[PDB]
Amino acid sequence: MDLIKYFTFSMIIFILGIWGILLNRRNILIMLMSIELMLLAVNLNFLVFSVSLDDMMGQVFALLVLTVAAAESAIGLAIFVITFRVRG
């Protein structure tokens, strides 16, 4: 039983990212890392499902998700550095 272990590990990463984004309303930096963790967990879900079913629609979409993750991180840090310019 390894599919179960993979899915549980990814789900715990997902809930841990939710945990991280929920607690600290002010850090604004841990939130982005938690969002990246959520995207990572979902990517592992898709890749593991693709391997198990011998279907290719999982890896294509997992690869496409990386573009969204990178764009979200870039825009997030742009807005973060804009916000930080106001204070301090």
Partner 1 sequence: MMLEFAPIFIYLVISLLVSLILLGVPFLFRFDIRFYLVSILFLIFDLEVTFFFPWAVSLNKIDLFGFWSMMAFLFILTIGFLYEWKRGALDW
Partner 2 sequence: RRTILPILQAEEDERFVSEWKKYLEYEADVMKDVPGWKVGENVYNSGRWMPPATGELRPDVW
Partner 3 sequence: ASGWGITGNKGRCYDFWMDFSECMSHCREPKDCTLLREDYLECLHHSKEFQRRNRIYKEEQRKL
51 binds partner 1 (CB under 8 A): no
79 binds partner 1 (CB under 8 A): no
> Of these, 54, 81, 86, 88, which contacts partner 3 (CB under 8 A)?
54
50 binds partner 3 (CB under 8 A): yes
Least separation in angstroms between residue 78's CB and partner 1 is: 8
C-alpha distance from residue 47 to each of 4, 9, 62, 71, 75 (Å): 14, 13, 7, 21, 26
Taking CB atoms within 8 Å and a gap of at least 24, the contacts of 60-69 are: 65/39, 68/39, 69/36, 69/39
Residues contributing to the site for partner 3 (CB under 8 A): 50-57, 59
